[PDB]
Design an enzyme around this catalytic site. Structure first.
Site, short mmCIF file in Angstrom:
data_model
loop_
_atom_site.label_atom_id
_atom_site.label_comp_id
_atom_site.label_asym_id
_atom_site.label_seq_id
_atom_site.Cartn_x
_atom_site.Cartn_y
_atom_site.Cartn_z
N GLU A 175 -1.35 9.47 0.39
CA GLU A 175 -0.83 9.66 -0.95
C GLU A 175 -1.73 8.89 -1.91
O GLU A 175 -1.85 7.67 -1.77
CB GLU A 175 0.58 9.05 -0.98
CG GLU A 175 1.35 9.09 -2.28
CD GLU A 175 2.60 8.26 -2.16
OE1 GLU A 175 2.58 7.28 -1.43
OE2 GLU A 175 3.59 8.59 -2.78
N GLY A 192 0.75 -1.26 0.00
CA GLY A 192 0.00 0.00 0.00
C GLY A 192 0.78 1.31 0.00
O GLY A 192 1.97 1.37 0.34
N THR A 193 0.10 2.39 -0.37
CA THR A 193 0.72 3.70 -0.44
C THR A 193 0.79 4.34 0.94
O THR A 193 0.22 3.85 1.92
CB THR A 193 -0.06 4.65 -1.34
OG1 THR A 193 -1.44 4.63 -0.94
CG2 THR A 193 0.08 4.24 -2.78
N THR A 194 1.48 5.51 0.98
CA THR A 194 1.74 6.18 2.26
C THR A 194 0.54 6.72 2.88
O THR A 194 -0.27 7.23 2.13
CB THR A 194 2.80 7.29 2.01
OG1 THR A 194 3.99 6.78 1.45
CG2 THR A 194 3.19 8.04 3.33
#
Ligand SMILES: Nc1ncnc2c1ncn2[C@@H]1O[C@H](COP(=O)(O)OP(=O)(O)OP(=O)(O)O)[C@@H](O)[C@H]1O
Ligand SMILES: Nc1ncnc2c1ncn2[C@@H]1O[C@H](COP(=O)(O)OP(=O)(O)OP(=O)(O)O)[C@@H](O)[C@H]1O
Ligand SMILES: [Mg+2]
Ligand SMILES: [Mg+2]
Lengths: 243, 54, 125, 261, 54, 71, 241, 66
Positions: free
Chosen positions: A46, A29-31
């Site tokens: 993000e 996963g993204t931040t």
């Protein structure tokens, strides 16, 4: 070999292996970060612009629960949304019996107890999401991050995603710079900075930044999306800092 | 030994790194790893870094 | 959620005998000793007490219990499967002889009620 | 490659545990006479790979100054068989003559095969060369002026006769450097090189954990390449932050997560 | 190597193979470039448009 | 009997906890009792050094009838 | 293989599956000690603080159940709260169904029984928690009950649990030899906390500042844990003595 | 040493039998035609399928003729 296969069987030494495996999904996963402030709490994630075909500000991954608790997650992205359902069902259930919004420490406990079930039995799968959710009530602000194991802690700040390391070191340094708690009005700005730094990691596809805040002082305890002019001031501030 | 003496250079004709279509960035990093700590071994010694072993 | 041991976990060996029944005795043989002597005008039952520390006071735990006021019972083997087994026993003695004849059960009859539990803990999956 | 007392910074407590076994009865045998325990001998080093089991062996061979013999285990297997027994017999005699003497067996994973001897005839060359190290170490034979230090990666290859205390007093596990035992590793390797005036490490490394000592000295090599592109003579605090994010990434390519005994 | 997932965990690490460099599949540019590198030797016409093929 | 100890140190506690031991693992623990003492510098092998050397190099070892409920 | 994956007997006759829970416990490494006073119980445990980013209140392995029963957990915290949940439910329930609040011993019994029903079903994994109940009954005075995921439980003068619990037990065995009686003769509950912290510093060899301790105290019809300031008051009294 | 399976032995007049003749036989008998184009001549060829069609019956044939 056979402890690797199985679900909810203790290893010889005593650990569950599929809890450990479930962590992998969090790092794909993204931040996303939360920042606990003196007033309330700020959420930010993000959102990767993976093609020129996506539409801007229409595939929002920030999702409220009731009208005072922001939720955004990292892990498997369908599997997130179904826990944002579960939350709603419990939220609403509490408002019928006790006629008041649910307290934030209580919202945490029951949400956790669901995750915990899927490591009790072998028949359903351990949930593959690490979540940030929090908001303000009468006790005040609370921030929580829930791990696939079924564990949460309170935090001055927390973060998740592939760029957690780069945010964790700035987040100490936002406990040192401001040891009494910065205002939530300052922290819109400080939130953007920490996404623009943890984007070198996911620098592959350009991004679009999303913040939201819930605080007793600004929005009257009502979680919202930062939008329009206040969203423009934070974007240009972190962009010219990190270049 | 006689296996190692055959392994020794025989001068194989270069194909040139400019005729290898695409993959611009891969040629630079390879050049950075093998070729440039041999030639410029003074600028690794001023800085105080070691050469990447492989 | 969904039980998926609906099937039985006990089955006959391709040599004859049920495999788990045989094992279950070897676990009884490890246990604490205890004894019973039938006399003419009484019975005596008695066991030793095995602790972990002298910090553990073993007075609080009872290994000899009463089922009914006239039928006691003592055990060897798994400590926890005694805790529940005696409970199950007391409770279904009461729901099959306390309502339907007043008096506590005769001693043969109570033994047979216990025996139904066991057999059945092997039949269900 | 020598270095004096320091080895793995942050583990100076573990450096003393190896000296308790080696340097204290060597110099003064009068402290182990009075207490009455038979003199020790035998140390096994094992941990996550990349941690400097090997750097400590250089630290304890320099300073003591007793005769050192660095005998790779895969570097004494030869084509001729019965010749890898006769050599290694002659070395234990050698360590008695030249006393005090320390024999560092390095990479014991080669002759770590167990019972087996149903497979190839090579698996019976191991077992026959290993029985001779077993009765030579402990038998009627008991050489008083020999010390053994043994370096092994995975400490579960070993035949269950080499796991076995009383062969091998201390069974030291080297830990992936600690919380600020990765930071003590970083402060001696950024002294060597030219820095702008950099002290901003402190958070950044702790958050790049999961790091062996061999991936701490790869980040100063990668922070002097980002510098070479700019044409710098010193490492910016931007080149260091580009490197730690890079080392971890590539170091994550593989990983059993080797779980110790 | 062709497969990297079965390399030893003390061969794969630093002090030993310092750089671990990946050779991605030619993207658009790479693809176009390749087709140009072999077609060069052989006979070409003004008709050939290597963007149509990429 | 070879080595020195205080009459404070008593071996009998250690006999009954664990019931599987070999003779070589009894030659090591006494080695490890007189090396912990060597960090205190207390010539006599105390009850703290002897109990601390036992707790080290014993492992999980839950096989011993002690870590149980079959009793 | 398949014998040890579910909860059936092994060919030996040991249920190795249950014994893997035993080693599942020690992952946090919290030591705890409890002791019986004359009229009050104390239980103390180590406060592990893994970062500075975490709020230190939430970190807590002491749970209040009710107005009498405190319950200290040594194990993973995901199981801990499922353990306290099902306790809360039952403890509540018992008041309604039976006319008075649930005594200490009685709760220990029900939690044993529940753990046993997960041992027979081939689709529930046993909880990995070791629970320590502390309360003050009316009849049985201060009591402590130590329960375990097999379903086994017994009464105790003073007990411990944690990786280093063999050190701590042997102190207690010296002292209840010298007293020649069951418990510390001490009316003031504050002064029992002092005596606990001294025999914990003995065993771990390691000191404690006001951010490494959790201290729970049980009295007659009130259960309270101790604030950051009040932790430092019982620690100033040790040190100035 | 020269098998006796000849080249007309193989069934049909398929276009697939001429592909065996265009990868192996033809560029070695005349390397004049694959030199004018400029192409690297194809050197490999895989024969695969269900049994009974002669994978070894056409690889003997091509060893007689070439
Ligand atoms: N503790 C340390 N302090 C300083 N440098 C270190 C340390 N640990 C490792 N290094 C660096 O890593 C390099 C290689 O590590 P070393 O070969 O000693 O590790 P190892 O555990 O013996 O691994 P292996 O034997 O599997 O190759 C060293 O030559 C040195 O540059
Ligand atoms: N296409 C064909 N035309 C004429 N005869 C054929 C053909 N394919 C097979 N045969 C006949 O069948 C016989 C046996 O077949 P062959 O052994 O070549 O099978 P194969 O293709 O090599 O299968 P596999 O290698 O899997 O067993 C040949 O000797 C030949 O007489
Ligand atoms: Mg080495
Ligand atoms: Mg064929």
């Amino acid at each position: 070999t056979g402890y690797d296969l199985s679900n909810s069987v203790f290893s010889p030494d005593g650990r569950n292996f599929q809890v450990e495996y479930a962590v992998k999904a969090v790092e794909n996963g993204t931040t996303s970060i939360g920042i606990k402030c003196n007033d309330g709490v700020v959420f930010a994630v993000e959102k990767l612009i993976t093609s020129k075909l996506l539409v801007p500000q229409k595939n929002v991954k920030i999702q409220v629960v009731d009208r005072h608790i922001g939720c955004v997650y990292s892990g498997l992205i369908p599997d997130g949304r179904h826990l944002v359902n579960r939350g709603r069902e419990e939220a609403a259930s509490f408002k019928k019996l006790y006629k008041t919004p649910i307290p934030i420490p209580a919202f945490a406990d029951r949400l956790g107890q669901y995750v915990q079930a899927h490591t009790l039995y072998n028949s359903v799968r351990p949930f593959g999401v690490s979540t940030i959710f929090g908001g303000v009530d009468k006790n005040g602000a609370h921030l929580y991050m829930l791990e696939p194991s079924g564990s949460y802690w309170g935090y001055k700040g927390a973060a998740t995603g592939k760029g957690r390391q780069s945010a964790k070191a700035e987040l100490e340094k936002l406990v040192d710079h401001h040891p009494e708690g910065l205002s939530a009005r300052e922290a819109v700005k400080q939130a953007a900075k920490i996404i623009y730094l943890a984007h070198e990691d996911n620098k592959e596809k350009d991004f679009e930044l999303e913040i939201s805040w819930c605080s007793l002082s600004e929005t009257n305890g009502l979680h919202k999306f930062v939008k329009g002019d206040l969203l423009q001031e934070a974007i240009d501030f972190a962009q010219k800092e990190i270049n | 030994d006689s296996r190692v003496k055959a392994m020794e250079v025989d001068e194989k004709p270069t194909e040139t790194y400019s005729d290898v279509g695409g993959l611009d960035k891969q040629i630079e990093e390879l050049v950075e790893a093998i070729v440039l700590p041999m030639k410029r071994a003074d600028k690794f010694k001023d800085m105080g870094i070691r050469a990447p072993k492989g | 959620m969904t039980d998926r041991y609906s099937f039985s976990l006990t089955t006959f060996s391709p040599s004859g005998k049920l495999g788990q029944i045989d094992y279950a005795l070897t676990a009884v043989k490890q246990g604490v000793t205890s004894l019973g002597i039938k006399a003419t005008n009484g019975v005596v039952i008695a066991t030793e007490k095995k602790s972990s520390s002298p910090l553990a006071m073993s007075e609080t735990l009872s290994k000899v219990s009463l089922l009914t006021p006239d039928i006691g019972a003592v055990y060897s083997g798994m400590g926890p499967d005694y805790r529940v087994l005696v409970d199950k026993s007391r409770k279904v003695a009461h729901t099959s002889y306390k309502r339907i004849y007043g008096e506590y059960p005769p001693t043969k009859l109570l033994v047979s009620e216990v025996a139904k539990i066991m057999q059945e803990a092997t039949q269900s999956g | 490659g020598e270095i004096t007392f320091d080895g793995i910074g942050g583990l100076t407590e573990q450096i003393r545990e190896l000296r308790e076994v080696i340097e204290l009865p060597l110099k003064n045998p009068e402290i182990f006479q009075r207490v009455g325990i038979k003199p020790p001998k035998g140390v096994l080093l094992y941990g996550p790979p990349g941690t400097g089991k090997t750097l400590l062996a250089k630290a304890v061979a320099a300073t003591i100054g007793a005769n050192f013999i660095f005998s790779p285990a895969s570097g004494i297997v030869d084509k001729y068989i019965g010749e890898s027994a006769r050599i290694i017999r002659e070395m234990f005699a050698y360590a008695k003559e030249h006393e005090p003497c320390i024999i560092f067996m390095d990479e014991v994973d080669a002759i770590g095969g167990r019972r087996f001897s149903e497979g190839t005839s090579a698996d019976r060359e191991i077992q026959r060369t290993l029985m001779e190290l077993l009765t030579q170490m402990d038998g009627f034979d008991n050489l008083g002026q020999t010390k053994i230090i043994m370096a092994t990666n995975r400490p579960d290859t070993l035949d269950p006769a080499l796991l076995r205390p009383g062969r091998l007093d201390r069974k030291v596990e080297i830990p992936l450097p600690n919380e600020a035992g990765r930071l003590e590793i970083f402060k001696i390797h950024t002294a060597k090189v030219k820095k702008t005036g950099e002290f901003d490490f402190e958070a950044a490394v702790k958050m790049s954990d999961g790091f062996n000592g061999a991936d701490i000295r790869n980040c100063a090599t990668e922070a002097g390449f980002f510098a070479i592109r700019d044409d710098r003579d010193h490492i910016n605090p931007d080149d260091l932050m580009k490197a730690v994010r890079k080392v971890a990434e590539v170091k994550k390519l593989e990983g059993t997560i080797e779980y110790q005994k | 190597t062709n497969r990297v997932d079965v390399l030893d965990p003390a061969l794969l690490r630093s002090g030993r193979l310092d750089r671990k460099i990946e050779f991605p599949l030619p993207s658009e540019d790479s693809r176009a470039q390749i087709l140009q590198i072999h077609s060069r030797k052989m006979t070409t016409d003004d008709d050939i448009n290597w963007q149509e093929l990429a | 009997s070879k080595m020195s100890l205080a009459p404070e140190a008593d071996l009998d506690s250690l006999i009954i906890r664990n019931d599987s031991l070999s003779g070589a693992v009894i030659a090591a623990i006494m080695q490890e009792a007189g090396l912990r003492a060597v960090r205190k510098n207390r010539y006599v092998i105390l009850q703290s050094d002897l109990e601390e050397a036992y707790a080290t190099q014993v492992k999980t070892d839950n096989t011993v009838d002690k870590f149980d409920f079959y009793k | 293989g398949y014998d040890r994956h579910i909860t059936i007997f092994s060919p030996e006759g040991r249920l190795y599956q249950v014994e893997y829970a035993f080693k599942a416990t020690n992952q946090t490494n919290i030591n705890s000690l409890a002791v019986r006073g004359k009229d009050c119980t104390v239980v103390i445990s180590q406060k592990k603080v893994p970062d500075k980013l975490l709020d230190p209140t939430t970190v807590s392995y002491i749970f209040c159940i009710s107005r009498t029963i405190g319950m200290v957990v040594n194990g993973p915290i995901p199981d801990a709260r499922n353990a306290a949940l099902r306790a809360k439910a039952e403890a509540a329930e018992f008041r309604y169904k039976y006319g008075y609040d649930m005594p200490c011993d009685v709760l220990a019994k029900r939690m044993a029984n529940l753990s046993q029903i997960y041992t027979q079903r081939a689709y529930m994994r046993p909880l990995g928690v070791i629970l320590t109940f502390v309360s003050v009954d009316e009849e049985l005075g201060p009591s402590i009950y130590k329960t375990d995921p097999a379903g086994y439980y017994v009464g105790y003068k003073a007990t411990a649990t944690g990786p280093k619990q063999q050190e701590i037990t042997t102190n207690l065995e010296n002292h209840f030899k010298k007293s020649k009686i069951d418990h510390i003769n001490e009316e003031s509950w504050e002064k029992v906390v002092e005596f606990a912290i001294t025999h914990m510093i003995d065993a771990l060899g390691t000191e404690f500042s006001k951010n490494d301790l959790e201290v729970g105290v049980a009295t007659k019809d009130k259960f309270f844990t101790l604030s950051a300031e009040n932790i430092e008051e019982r620690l100033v009294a040790i040190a100035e003595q | 040493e020269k098998p006796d399976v000849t080249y007309s032995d193989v069934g049909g007049c398929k276009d697939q039998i001429e592909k065996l003749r265009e990868v192996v036989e033809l560029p070695l008998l005349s390397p004049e035609r694959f030199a004018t184009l400029g192409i690297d001549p194809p050197k490999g060829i895989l024969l695969y399928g269900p049994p009974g069609t002669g994978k070894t019956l056409c690889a003997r044939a091509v060893a007689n003729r070439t």
